[PDB]
Design a binder for this molecule. Structure first.
Ligand SMILES: C=C(C)[C@@H]1CCC(C)=C[C@H]1c1c(O)cc(O)cc1CCCCC
Length: 134
């Protein structure tokens, strides 16, 4: 494990378009989504996490415990129900989102004090990095 906690500013983002296409996000929504640049806020306490993705249009957050399956409504995203599970893959926090789409999930890790994220669905990987905001 690693301490991923913090307030994180999006610094780079690659292939968000392909990830959203894999999710079927509509044309006008993809346009807006690529402009929003949400702040990522990770609250981490032992095995308990709350990960926020915050923008002016709306916030999304997920609250979970490592190793504890939970249904995720994805409301405000693609609105598809998944059964999600987050576990540590060495020092990379890995979420499997079981549902209609294949190979759907995300992974966070930290390199120095730089936060990394892959969001992926059916072969489309969106790679983002972040810097600590404050
Ligand atoms: C929760 C949000 C701030 C937005 C909400 C609206 C959409 C369609 C995408 C989210 C979004 C965004 O607009 C930019 C991002 O870099 C990441 C994400 C979260 C993942 C969205 C996957 C559909």
């Amino acid at each position: 494990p690693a301490d991923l906690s913090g307030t994180w500013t999006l610094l780079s983002s690659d292939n968000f378009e392909g990830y959203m296409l894999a999710l079927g996000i509509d044309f006008a929504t993809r346009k807006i989504a690529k402009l929003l640049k949400p702040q990522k806020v990770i609250e981490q306490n032992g095995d308990s996490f709350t990960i926020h993705t915050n923008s002016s249009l709306r916030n999304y957050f997920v609250k979970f415990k490592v190793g504890e399956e939970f249904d995720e409504d994805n409301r405000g995203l693609d609105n598809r129900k998944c059964k999600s599970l987050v576990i540590w893959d060495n020092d990379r926090l890995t979420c499997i989102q079981k549902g209609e789409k294949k190979n759907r999930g995300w992974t966070h890790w930290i390199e120095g004090d730089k936060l990394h994220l892959e969001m992926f669905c059916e072969g489309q990987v969106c790679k983002q990095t972040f810097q600590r905001a404050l």
